[PDB]
């Protein structure tokens, strides 16, 4: 059951290539497409096929589609040294971008450009046999992650209302950010999507730049330095379909996301440790995840209950150790909703997880990834919504909006939304 | 350490279980709608600028139309000044030498009855 | 690739103008006939930007050069970049506008304004995505001022969706031209509210002041006080000239920085001040210095709505980042609470000639209504009396007109001070 | 293009015409037969000369003037002078009964007999101009020609050419070297009828130039030539951003922006400096400064008028010579500073400032000294109004006993004229004082 | 340009207007045969202004009723000078009848003047005006020379007429109705002429008795000095300068009212034909003396007066400074005797070449109200006679009627009368 790949914007985009390039590492596919340890050429139905399709000449392609309304971005797929792995159909460049508008990105040149990469989608998955659904990168502060985003998703549910939609989203960081209207932008384009997906993990930039910053012990982390982190967490989160517990999307919506609303789960990972010995406990890296230094969003999970949580894990685990490593952290008193199971959903996949040779992560023998939906991910909308009131009660910049045709009311229809998801969140917490 | 480990999917390089500690629309039409509602009101805009913009063109018609008009009434009353007084310093110039001639004449006609005066006195 | 169309009308418009492709040109390498001669690919990867690929291996600066009288222009023909520009870009008359802003706007203005448009059509069929317009010109003249608007005011009728940004020389009794500034300056600042989506306000003031008093010079040369305006024109463009992390545009810029569409007059500002390389923290703390502003206000007396910083040459951007939030962190009253991370820096590794490390400021502060203040007293002084008022009655201008301008100028002082207190 | 007319009328403006064309001829190259010997764009090219100078076939350089004179005396030492050659004859227009020093006949009985002629040379040099500036038109106050005729040219032009630009450059009547006890007469109605005629009006008087040359020369009586010779520096300072190819120039348009702060006062007087003998002509040069103050002083003022018995309205300094605008700013800069120089409170610039780099030059042989460095000052300062006082009360002096009026009456004019040019004047003494009046 | 016609008529006219030809003419080095024979150059260059070229020939007219008078001024040096076609006579005098010359026989052959006039007149490239000289005594020169210059005016209205007029004095002539001619001329001079230079012979007769010490003057002196003033009056008019040599710019200037044009004219110095002349008079001595009323060519005293207007030419190589000096000095060191309601009433000219003999020598024309005590002896004498009607006869058998006689006194009387409003006149 095949599934399909988009990347968004800079940041969907950029991120996608530190993903792929993972993928064909852990299944040791080299650049020019070959796969020395694939021998079912141009077919077959194994795991790793259902995020690469083959071709005659045995070339693995990546199911994915590419797509920013500014070119920089894609010419460095379209030129870089990955650049065999795709066609050059499922790359798709406008040449204006959304200039950090919701509203450009959405309402102006979306309507403009939606039908190509619909058809681009069309044509990929009329290459799956079955197709369980999409996983979508983008930004939530840029224009075109924001604004052409939300435009795709309620067009990909009228189109593929049979398929599941799950959600790589980036939230915007002070410290690591490039415009003051990402408040709008993200409020905007989760209002939208919010009906339209069925899971979405979101990414807090400065967490994993305080997560480098610590565990790496770097400078100031580069945007690639970021985003080979963001690689080893959503590899583990794919890595289910990969090799076939969460071997169908529809798992995901199931297993983590109890209501339709509150399918933000918060994603945590372990162990990073620099390139710059030998392995750390079973226990170790399972303890990690429940301190908030590893999360990937910022916030407290002890002001939070779970309703439910997932625990991956990779490399040299049985199921003895976590057992032993998940009876002993019950010695923090972590409380969950009284209407879901104290528990976790446990998954093990023997092989080593992978790392970019040369990266400043080390190779290591064992890492889990824990993905909970958490009531606490609520602060992480608080600090958002805040933000926005601020220049949202002065009206400041949204005349940039109106001038794409926006009504103003949009602003707060999607700002009561987002006081309804949050007064929700409390209303299980 | 009681946990109910329920032991699920299981193969070659992969298992699964879940350790239990306790117990506990899509309208096409409408998206479209609202994508030329907002093309419309984008047009709606840009119409009001446009039409802005042509009365500040016809302003710009307007100055230069009052600059040909002074710049046209002035030729026209400074000829007509200078006409006006050209022509009424010659009827006053005019009836100056005009006058002094007809005293002139005046004296030449009393200058005939003096001779006229004599000869009937040289009748005596 | 986003190509954008430079304009320089009137005598400093066109002077300034000329200096800065002067010195953009030599940043990237370029020599008088047009041929590239630098030394790296960085010079060359956003060159179509602001240059055409000539018909040989040479580039040529999309700019326009306007004048209504035929001097200024003819010098700049024999500086040494005069070659460089198109020949069929010049675009002049011969009446000239008698530093008269309804000469430049009305009647004058409007026998060449079909002209130049025609070359500005002409480059724009040249682009493959035109991004917008960048103007220099002064507001104190005729021609800068009074047709500058009027081109911009056209031009914006034929390409509405593009950006329009103004360099506009703000004038001043220390370096002055004519005795009517007050007026032409009052009239079109009135047009630069509502025709160009920002605008970078160079005081002469300002230029004279620093120029004077910190560079100690007995009295300025002009090349001296356009030198300031060059490399503070330099430095507010190098993001869109250089390559980097992110792809600079206008309406980005335009879009973080103006908060409403009427407070789109921006706080040029630079540093070292040049008449041993300075150190990071020594540069953000001069940039953000009143004495570093190419516009005669006081930072301390307005509070800053959104303010972009460009660094420029080889240091360490942590260094940058923690220095731009210390002042940020330490002044903490003179930025607005309502408009969070209202402080966004960039940094590019090359830096401009003869400087090793240098810093660029562009602030959008509400202390600039003491700007529009200044001209303001000085238009009353003239208006209350009508002195010299004749010139512009004479070509069809009415009273109201000047009346209409005050009042608006004077509003725009108002809302600025409206922000100053908003919490 | 940007060409400009040069209209010289009477004795006094023809032998300043004189006067400033050889000086044009001396700074440009030009020999007396008319061939520049550094324009190599023969009959033809528009170079920076061209606005006073048009080129023939033959190359012969020949003036943008037109000499008009009800008499042809001084017209006819200008057809027999070494610069004959320079003019078409059809360029010097000469009557052959002058205006008797009567404006009446100027104006009206004698003037209208060549008036059309006059305008219609007028026509044609303005037929060989693709961008026609505007006229300089030269003449006195006090003649009957200078007053009577150049008014009556100045309302025709009016008609032919609309508002197009007349500059005028007047010498003011000034008793110790005055010719006509009517001189009262005629410079009052002149003014009053050029007034909406003229957009502004240069002004110098023979008193002050002669006082100047006396002092600063050595000499103990200065012929007209030699006030003549000091004028012509003073015309060409004017004309020089426009004959020359500048850095910063001062057209025809930009003087009347800058000096006629009201229609009716438009009347800036001329100062010049330096003014130095030939004899001890090469001791160290002056200043930029020492010329820039020695143009505020009452001393070397055209008009002898006291400054600081008035406000400065617009100052318009234009330097030639070794000067650059760096030394004119910073002299400008401290003459802002001085408290006995004082400005109007509704014009807070107060400057305009053109300059030329080409050096002033001198009529080799006469008694001026050449120099690297001079200025003329334009000052419209309301002080100039006890100069229209000190004619206007000779003007009563004779009006309330109808002295000399007879001979105006006899050739056509009513004694309503000279009430309506009086109460005229009577205006301009009361906007000159009202102008001057703080907000 | 600017020819004038010289007219002359009755004895005095001609014997001074033939004096006046003598001392110009050697001025401009022009023998009686009429050739030039000059030093100078500048002796040309305005020798048409008075002389045509045929040999110069001077464009004067000769008229006198008796015809005798024409066969004397041919007879005396630079007789045959004068064109013949010029010379118009009739059969005999007038007999110092006013009425002969104005009414009956001189209007005879004033038709035969007005024909040369034209002819001369004709040939003009542009004609300035007319002067005559005549007395004013008589009644050729008076009678008919007034009757000649009103028939003048009529064809030439636009055209100068000025005159040298000489008023008649008991001291050189016991004629006795010359009062009657004076006062008739008088009142025709005072409205068609545009300046009269008056030439007292009372005064002339007090000049070389008091002053040059002469002890029966004849004619021949008296025709001496007014040759002397009518050259020194006219010499800017006959040599070039600066100045333009005009008649309608000295009489615009000289003239503030149409009846006061008569004018007084003085001299220095003032010398006998063969004096020695040992030294020549400075600046100073000439410009004190001038304004004397010993110089005075009209018996006036011009200190009972005051000044309207004052023109003066200086003959010689001087100083133009010194000129200046001399001549400021006299009017503030004597500035009550100038109206005040005239600003710069007095104005001064200068020329190079001095007359003959006299290397220094100055010309004064004032315009003074003092002329009314000329005028006011005319009219004493006049109305003495015309109390008792005294000789009527003589003119009312020509045809006049006395209320003429009325008219011209009566104007004459108006005349004196302007001359003291403005003697008296106050600045406000
Ligand atoms: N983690 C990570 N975040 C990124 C990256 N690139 C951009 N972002 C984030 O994305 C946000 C802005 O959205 P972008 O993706 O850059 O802009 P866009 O999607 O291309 O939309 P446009 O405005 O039309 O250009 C900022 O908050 C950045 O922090 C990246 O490579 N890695
Ligand atoms: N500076 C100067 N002033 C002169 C000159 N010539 C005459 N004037 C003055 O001009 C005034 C007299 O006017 P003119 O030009 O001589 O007279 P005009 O124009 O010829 O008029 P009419 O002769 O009356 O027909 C007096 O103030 C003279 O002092 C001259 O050459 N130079
Ligand atoms: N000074 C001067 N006066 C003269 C001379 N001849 C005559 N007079 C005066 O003229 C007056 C007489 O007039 P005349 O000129 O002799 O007479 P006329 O003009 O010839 O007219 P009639 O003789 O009557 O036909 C007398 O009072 C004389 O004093 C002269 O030669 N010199
Ligand atoms: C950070 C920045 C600094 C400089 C430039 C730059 O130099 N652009 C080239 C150009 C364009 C137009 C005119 N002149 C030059 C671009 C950016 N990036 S940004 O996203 O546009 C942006 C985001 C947020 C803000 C502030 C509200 C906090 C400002 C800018
Ligand atoms: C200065 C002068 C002296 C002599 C003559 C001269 O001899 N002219 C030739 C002539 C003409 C007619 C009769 N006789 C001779 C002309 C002038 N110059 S002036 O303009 O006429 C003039 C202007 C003002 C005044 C004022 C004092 C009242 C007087 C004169
Ligand atoms: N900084 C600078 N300012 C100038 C320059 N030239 C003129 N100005 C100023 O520009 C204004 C006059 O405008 P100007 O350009 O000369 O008039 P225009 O030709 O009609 O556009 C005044 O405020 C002058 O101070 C220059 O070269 N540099
Ligand atoms: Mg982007
Ligand atoms: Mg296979
Ligand atoms: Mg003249
Ligand atoms: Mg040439
Ligand atoms: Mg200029
Ligand atoms: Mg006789």
């Given at each position: 059951?095949?599934?399909?790949?988009?990347?968004?914007?800079?940041?969907?985009?950029?991120?996608?290539?530190?993903?792929?390039?993972?993928?064909?590492?852990?299944?040791?596919?080299?650049?020019?497409?070959?796969?020395?340890?694939?021998?079912?050429?141009?077919?077959?139905?194994?795991?790793?096929?259902?995020?690469?399709?083959?071709?005659?000449?045995?070339?693995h392609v990546p199911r994915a589609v590419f797509v920013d309304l500014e070119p920089t971005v894609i010419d460095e797929v379209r030129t870089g040294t990955y650049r065999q792995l795709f066609h050059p159909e499922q790359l798709i460049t406008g040449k204006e971008d959304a200039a950090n508008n919701y509203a450009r990105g959405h309402y102006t040149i979306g309507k403009e450009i939606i039908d190509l990469v619909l058809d681009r989608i069309r044509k990929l998955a009329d290459q799956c046999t079955?197709?369980?659904?999409?996983?979508?990168?983008?930004?939530?502060?840029?224009?075109?992650?924001?604004?052409?985003?939300?435009?795709?998703?309620?067009?990909?549910?009228?189109?593929?209302?049979?398929?599941?939609?799950?959600?790589?989203?980036?939230?915007?960081?002070?410290?690591?950010?490039?415009?003051?209207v990402e408040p709008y932008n993200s409020i905007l384009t989760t209002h939208t999507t919010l009906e339209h997906s069925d899971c979405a993990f979101m990414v807090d930039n400065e967490a994993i730049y305080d997560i480098c910053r610590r565990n790496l012990d770097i400078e100031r982390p580069t945007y690639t330095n970021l985003n080979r982190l963001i690689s080893q967490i959503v590899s583990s989160i794919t890595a289910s379909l990969r090799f076939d517990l969460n071997v169908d999307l529809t798992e995901f919506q199931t297993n983590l996301v109890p209501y339709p609303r509150i399918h933000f789960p918060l994603a945590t990972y372990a162990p990073v440790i620099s390139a710059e010995h030998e392995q750390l406990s079973v226990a170790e890296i399972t303890n990690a995840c429940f301190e908030p230094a590893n999360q990937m969003v910022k916030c407290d999970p002890r002001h939070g209950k779970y309703m439910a949580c997932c625990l991956l894990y990779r490399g040299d685990v049985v199921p003895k150790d976590v057992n032993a490593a998940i009876a002993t952290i019950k010695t923090r008193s972590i409380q969950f909703v009284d209407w879901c199971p104290t528990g976790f959903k446990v998954g093990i996949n023997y092989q080593p997880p992978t790392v970019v040779p040369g990266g400043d992560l080390a190779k290591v023998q064992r890492a889990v990834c824990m993905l909970s939906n958490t009531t606490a991910i609520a602060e992480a909308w608080a600090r958002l919504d805040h933000k926005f009131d601020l220049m949202y009660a002065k009206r400041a910049f949204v005349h940039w909006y109106v001038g794409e045709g926006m009504e103003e009311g949009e602003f707060s229809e999607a700002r009561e939304d987002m006081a309804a998801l949050e007064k929700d969140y409390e209303e299980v917490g | 350490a009681d946990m109910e480990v329920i032991e699920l999917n299981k193969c070659t390089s992969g298992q699964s279980f879940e350790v239990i500690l306790k117990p506990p629309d899509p309208s096409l039409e409408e998206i479209q709608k609202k994508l030329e509602a907002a093309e419309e009101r984008r047009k709606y805009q840009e119409a009001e600028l446009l039409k802005h913009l042509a009365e500040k063109r016809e302003?710009?018609?307007?100055?230069?139309?009052?600059?040909?008009?002074?710049?046209?009434?002035?030729?026209?009353?400074?000829?007509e000044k200078l006409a006006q007084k050209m022509e009424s310093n010659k009827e006053n110039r005019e009836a100056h030498l005009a006058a002094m001639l007809e005293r002139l004449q005046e004296k030449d006609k009393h200058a005939e009855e003096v001779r006229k005066n004599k000869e009937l006195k040289e009748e005596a | 690739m986003r190509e954008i169309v430079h304009i320089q009308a009137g005598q400093c418009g066109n002077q300034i103008g000329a200096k800065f492709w002067e010195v953009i040109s030599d940043e990237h390498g370029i020599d008088p006939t047009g041929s590239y001669h630098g030394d790296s690919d960085l010079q060359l990867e956003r060159i179509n930007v602001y240059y055409n690929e000539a018909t040989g291996n040479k580039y040529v600066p999309r700019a326009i050069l306007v004048d209504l009288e035929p001097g200024t222009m003819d010098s700049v023909r024999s500086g040494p970049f005069g070659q460089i520009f198109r020949p069929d870009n010049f675009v002049f008359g011969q009446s000239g506008a008698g530093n008269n802003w309804a000469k430049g706007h009305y009647t004058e203005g409007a026998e060449l304004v079909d002209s130049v448009l025609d070359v500005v059509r002409k480059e724009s069929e040249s682009c493959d995505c035109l991004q917008g317009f960048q103007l220099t010109h002064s507001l104190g003249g005729g021609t800068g001022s009074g047709m500058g608007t009027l081109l911009i005011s056209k031009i914006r009728e034929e390409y509405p969706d593009r950006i329009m940004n103004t360099f506009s020389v703000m004038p001043s009794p220390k370096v002055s031209d004519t005795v009517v500034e007050p007026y032409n300056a009052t009239l079109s600042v009135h047009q630069l509210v509502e025709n160009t989506d920002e605008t970078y306000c160079i005081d002469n003031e300002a230029l004279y002041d620093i120029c004077f008093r910190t560079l100690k010079l007995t009295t300025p040369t002009y090349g001296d006080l356009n030198h300031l305006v060059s490399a503070t024109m330099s430095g507010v463009t190098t993001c869109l000239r250089f390559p980097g992390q992110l792809n600079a545009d206008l309406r980005k810029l335009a879009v973080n920085m103006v908060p409403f569409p009427?407070?789109?007059?921006?706080?040029?500002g630079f540093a070292p001040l040049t008449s041993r390389a300075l150190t990071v923290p020594e540069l953000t703390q001069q940039m953000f210095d009143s004495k570093n502003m190419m516009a005669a206000c006081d930072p301390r007396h307005g509070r800053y709505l959104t303010v972009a910083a460009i660094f420029r040459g080889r240091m360490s951007m942590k260094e940058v980042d923690e220095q731009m939030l210390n002042v940020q962190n330490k002044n903490s009253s003179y930025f607005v609470e309502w408009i969070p991370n209202n402080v966004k820096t960039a940094v590019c590794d090359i830096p401009p000639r003869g400087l090793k490390?240098?810093?660029?400021?562009?602030?959008?502060?509400?202390?600039?209504?003491?700007?529009f203040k200044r001209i303001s007293e000085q238009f009353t002084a003239m208006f209350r009396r009508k002195a010299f008022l004749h010139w512009y009655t004479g070509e069809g201008m009415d009273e109201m007109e000047f009346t209409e301008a005050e009042s608006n100028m004077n509003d725009l002082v108002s809302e600025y001070q409206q922000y100053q207190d908003a919490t």
């Open positions: 059951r095949e599934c399909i790949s988009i990347h968004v914007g800079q940041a969907g985009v950029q991120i996608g290539n530190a993903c792929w390039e993972l993928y064909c590492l852990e299944h040791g596919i080299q650049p020019d497409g070959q796969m020395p340890s694939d021998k079912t050429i141009g077919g077959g139905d194994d795991s790793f096929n259902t995020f690469f399709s083959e071709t005659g000449a045995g070339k079955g197709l369980q659904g999409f996983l979508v990168f983008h930004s939530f502060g840029g224009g075109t992650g924001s604004g052409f985003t939300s435009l795709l998703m309620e067009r990909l549910s009228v189109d593929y209302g049979k398929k599941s939609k799950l959600e790589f989203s980036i939230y915007p960081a002070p410290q690591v950010s490039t415009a003051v | 302003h710009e018609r307007e100055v230069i139309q009052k600059a040909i008009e002074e710049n046209n009434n002035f030729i026209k009353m400074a000829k | 009427r407070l789109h007059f921006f706080m040029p490390m240098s810093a660029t400021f562009i602030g959008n502060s509400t202390a600039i209504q003491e700007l």
